[PDB]
Amino acid sequence: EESQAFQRQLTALIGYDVTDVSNVHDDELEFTRRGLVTPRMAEVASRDPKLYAMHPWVTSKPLPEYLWKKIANNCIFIVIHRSTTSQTIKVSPDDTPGAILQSFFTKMDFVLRVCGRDEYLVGETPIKNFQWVRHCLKNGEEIHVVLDTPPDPALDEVRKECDRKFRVKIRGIDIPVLDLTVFVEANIQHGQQVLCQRRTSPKPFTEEVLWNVWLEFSIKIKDLPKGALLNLQIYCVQLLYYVNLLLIDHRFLLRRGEYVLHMWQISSFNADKLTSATNPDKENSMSISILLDNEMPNQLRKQLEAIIATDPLNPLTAEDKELLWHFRYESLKHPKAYPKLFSSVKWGQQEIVAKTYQLLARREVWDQSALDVGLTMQLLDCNFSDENVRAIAVQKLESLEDDDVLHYLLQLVQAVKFEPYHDSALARFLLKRGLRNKRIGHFLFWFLRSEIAQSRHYQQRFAVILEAYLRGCGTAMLHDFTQQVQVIEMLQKVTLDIKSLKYDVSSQVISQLKQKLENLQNSQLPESFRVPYDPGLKAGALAIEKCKVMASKKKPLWLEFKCADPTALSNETIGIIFKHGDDLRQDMLILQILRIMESIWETESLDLCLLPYGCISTGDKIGMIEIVKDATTIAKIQQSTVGNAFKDEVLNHWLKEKSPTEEKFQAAVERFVYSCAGYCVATFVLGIGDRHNDNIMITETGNLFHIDFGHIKERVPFVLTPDFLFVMGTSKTSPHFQKFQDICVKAYLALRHHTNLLIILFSMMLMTGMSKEDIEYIRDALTVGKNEEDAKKYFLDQIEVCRDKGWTVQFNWFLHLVL
Numbered sequence: 013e014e015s016q017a018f019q020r021q022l023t024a025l026i027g028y029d030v031t032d033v034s035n036v037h038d039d040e041l042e043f044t045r046r047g048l049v050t051p052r053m054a055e056v057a058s059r060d061p062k063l064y065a066m067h068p069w070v071t072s073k074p075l076p077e078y079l080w081k082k083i084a085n086n087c088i089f090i091v092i093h094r095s096t097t098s099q100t101i102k103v104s105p106d107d108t109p110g111a112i113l114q115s116f117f118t119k120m121d122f123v124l125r126v127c128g129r130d131e132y133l134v135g136e137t138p139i140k141n142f143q144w145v146r147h148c149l150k151n152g153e154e155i156h157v158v159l160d161t162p163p164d165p166a167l168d169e170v171r172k173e174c175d176r177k178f179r180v181k182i183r184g185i186d187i188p189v190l191d192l193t194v195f196v197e198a199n200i201q202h203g204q205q206v207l208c209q210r211r212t213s214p215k216p217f218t219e220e221v222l223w224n225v226w227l228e229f230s231i232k233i234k235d236l237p238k239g240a241l242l243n244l245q246i247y248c249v250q251l252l253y254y255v256n257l258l259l260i261d262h263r264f265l266l267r268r269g270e271y272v273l274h275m276w277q278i279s280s281f282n283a284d285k286l287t288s289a290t291n292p293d294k295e296n297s298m299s300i301s302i303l304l305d306n307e308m309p310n311q312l313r314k315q316l317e318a319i320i321a322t323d324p325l326n327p328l329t330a331e332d333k334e335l336l337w338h339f340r341y342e343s344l345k346h347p348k349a350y351p352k353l354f355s356s357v358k359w360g361q362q363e364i365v366a367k368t369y370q371l372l373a374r375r376e377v378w379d380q381s382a383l384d385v386g387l388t389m390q391l392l393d394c395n396f397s398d399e400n401v402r403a404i405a406v407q408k409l410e411s412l413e414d415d416d417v418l419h420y421l422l423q424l425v426q427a428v429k430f431e432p433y434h435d436s437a438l439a440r441f442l443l444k445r446g447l448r449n450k451r452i453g454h455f456l457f458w459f460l461r462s463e464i465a466q467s468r469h470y471q472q473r474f475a476v477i478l479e480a481y482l483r484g485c486g487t488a489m490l491h492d493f494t495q496q497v498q499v500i501e502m503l504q505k506v507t508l509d510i511k512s513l514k515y516d517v518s519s520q521v522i523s524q525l526k527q528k529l530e531n532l533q534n535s536q537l538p539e540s541f542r543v544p545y546d547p548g549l550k551a552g553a554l555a556i557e558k559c560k561v562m563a564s565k566k567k568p569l570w571l572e573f574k575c576a577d578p579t580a581l582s583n584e585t586i587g588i589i590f591k592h593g594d595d596l597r598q599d600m601l602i603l604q605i606l607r608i609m610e611s612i613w614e615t616e617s618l619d620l621c622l623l624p625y626g627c628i629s630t631g632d633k634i635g636m637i638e639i640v641k642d643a644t645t646i647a648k649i650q651q652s653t654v655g656n657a658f659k660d661e662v663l664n665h666w667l668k669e670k671s672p673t674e675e676k677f678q679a680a681v682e683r684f685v686y687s688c689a690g691y692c693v694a695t696f697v698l699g700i701g702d703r704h705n706d707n708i709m710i711t712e713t714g715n716l717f718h719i720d721f722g723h724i725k726e727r728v729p730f731v732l733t734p735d736f737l738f739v740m741g742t743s744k745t746s747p748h749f750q751k752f753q754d755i756c757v758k759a760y761l762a763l764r765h766h767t768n769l770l771i772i773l774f775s776m777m778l779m780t781g782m783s784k785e786d787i788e789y790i791r792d793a794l795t796v797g798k799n800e801e802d803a804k805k806y807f808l809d810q811i812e813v814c815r816d817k818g819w820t821v822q823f824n825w826f827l828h829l830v831l
């Protein structure tokens with residue numbers, strides 16, 4: 013009654029009913045639900061109530077060199093507010109909020125909260141190590157803080173509670189609505205690698221096809237490893253339908269009995285092809301019926317080290333694998349060899365896997381090695397099905413601080429798609445970290461909710477994990493999630509309703525939007541809600557006056573909100589775009605990679621001023637986008653002076669008229685040089701550089717930024733046009749262009765220092781977000797095998813290609829958009 017009503021609340025928060033049993037052939041999901049109770053309760057019990065409530069956002073990384081240059085006399089200023097009075101206090105970079113509050117007690121307990129945000133500066137951390145402080149220093153802003161009472165931890169209340177050979181009988185296949193022939197392929201898969209394959213005889217493709225054939229495999233029963241899949245595929249030759257079945261279940265028991273599995277349709281490698289889930293659509297999908305009733309020389313060391321040295325994508329030959337295995341104990345001494353070593357394992361052999369587990373018992377070097385995320389990511393991809401192998405990776409992730417978890421959270425959530433079982437160390441890890449920290453927990457919610465909303469292949473698994481999180485996140489957050497979900501669902505209806513009503517925005521359309529938003533305001537739209545892409549901000553009532561439908565292809569919503577926090581230092585509005593038509597999952601993955609690149613450059617004291625805008629995918633081809641204020645499209649700047657032909661002088665003239673002083677114009681040029689170089693390198697490595705200038709924007713303060721990363725003859729490495737080069741002062745070279753080339757090289761080489769990581773993140777992105785030939789682009793782009801000097805020239809060539817191409821590519825883009 014009360015418990016059943018709480019389940020409906022969770023179902024409304026999740027967007028999927030976890031109690032549903034219409035689409036299962038076992039109890040794995042229910043076993044996982046029950047299995048996650050312990051790790052949930054264990055973290056909820058162990059977390060510090062006060063620190064969990066205030067969720068301080070901190071880093072233990074050293075402050076970069078450019079930020080130390082912006083602080084003089086070893087002194088940082090903080091303006092402390094209280095009701096109607098505010099005072100400035102000189103604070104040393106090492107001062108703890110506990111010690112600073114004592115200064116505002118002697119010079120004439122409470123807590124320091126950031127003005128206009130749900131962000132607190134508390135706990136035993138020096139203020140230099142608070143993220144907000146670092147953010148303020150980055151943009152050159154004074155830190156405004158308020159002295160108020162700490163939030164009550166009671167608000168985070170949690171509600172109480174055998175030598176036989178393997179064989180499979182193929183009975184037949186049937187489709188309600190389809191003179192070609194058809195056959196069934198049966199594979200024993202372990203980590204993408206096919207252990208054994210058997211086919212059936214081709215029969216005429218009809219509404220029902222029956223075989224009643226025993227398919228005897230070469231691999232024995234005992235030789236079957238845990239996490240092995242029975243891949244069943246239907247070829248007409250082209251593949252049409254696929255479905256999977258774990259041969260050994262979540263209880264270590266061999267699979268037996270009759271199975272009627274509804275299969276998936278086909279639109280090379282894809283994460284969706286690994287799924288243990290069956291198609292929920294019974295009425296329309298193809299289904300299959302089955303029956304189960306059962307020390308080393310100098311030369312070799314040099315060869316071994318060459319194998320270990322190679323990139324993650326370089327494939328191992330039989331020779332390479334046999335060498336790695338034979339010398340596994342020397343291979344075990346190199347953490348970088350681990351992925352390649354565990355790919356040399358014959359997993360279809362009981363005695364070998366046993367030796368592999370005996371090998372993992374001697375993890376002295378691995379355990380003691382400094383954490384390499386790139387390496388750790390490798391062991392979590394589709395190439396590895398073994399629980400123990402994968403577990404040693406998740407162990408390495410344990411030492412990541414909350415700051416670093418946020419950097420890899422999205423990819424780590426997507427990495428769950430590669431897990432053979434619903435319950436896994438990785439899932440438990442994501443559960444643990446999300447429950448420990450409110451910020452990780454906030455983004456965990458949305459990332460998991462995103463896939464539930466649009467992935468039939470993985471919604472069931474992710475729903476079990478989200479229910480797990482929500483059952484321990486506390487009433488306070490549960491309330492915050494409820495206000496958020498209601499808002500986006502309301503505004504998605506408005507987004508789709510307006511799009512229905514040529515690319516010209518008429519009078520009658522703009523009126524209808526204002527009408528609907530006025531009707532929602534007075535109705536059931538909550539007074540305030542957290543911004544999904546920025547949980548620090550609380551948005552309030554809609555500023556309908558400033559709301560509009562933009563003159564675009566997909567006709568998105570331009571929505572603006574008042575800040576719910578009265579302590580806000582400015583009367584700025586929170587701007588959000590709601591859009592249907594772009595695949596914002598792809599945008600999410602690119603932007604997250606962009607934020608990883610910003611962290612990579614920070615290690616080498618660089619700030620290339622990227623603007624990776626906030627973006628949350630909320631469903632199928634729909635979601636929200638942060639509005640970057642005071643920004644315009646490069647094409648629109650060309651339109652205002654020219655019309656439809658391009659002039660180099662336009663961009664520099666635009667920056668001048670948007671500048672009040674020369675002092676701020678010089679800052680606008682320097683910001684452009686850095687930000688252009690930033691996107692030039694990033695887009696080239698990712699293979700998303702060749703772009704029309706409609707999808708490239710700039711702010712009034714000079715900051716260039718790319719948008720709309722969905723779905724990506726003369727070609728170009730990146731967009732460096734004569735109007736960009738005119739801002740630098742070149743038509744020839746300039747002190748700004750010399751600075752530009754100096755930044756590009758230093759940035760490109762800095763990324764190349766993390767080659768493996770970027771390759772894995774890329775590889776994973778294509779498998780979870782969007783062939784082998786598509787992945788191999790990044791190897792060439794990062795010039796794997798070449799030295800720094802040789803690589804420095806390579807990118808300097810790419811820059812010279814853009815100057816030799818000029819407007820040609822952009823001109824061709826312009827013609828392409830006119831049919």
Ligand SMILES: Cc1nc(Nc2cnccn2)cc(-c2c(Nc3cc[nH]n3)nc3cccnn23)n1
Binds near residue numbers: 562591637638643
């Ligand atoms: C990050 C960002 N900032 C924006 N800010 C501004 C600010 N002023 C005027 C116009 N746009 C707009 C957009 C944006 C985006 N962003 C994205 C990102 C992904 N898809 N679309 N799409 C459109 C379409 C029409 C107009 N704007 N717009 N994106």
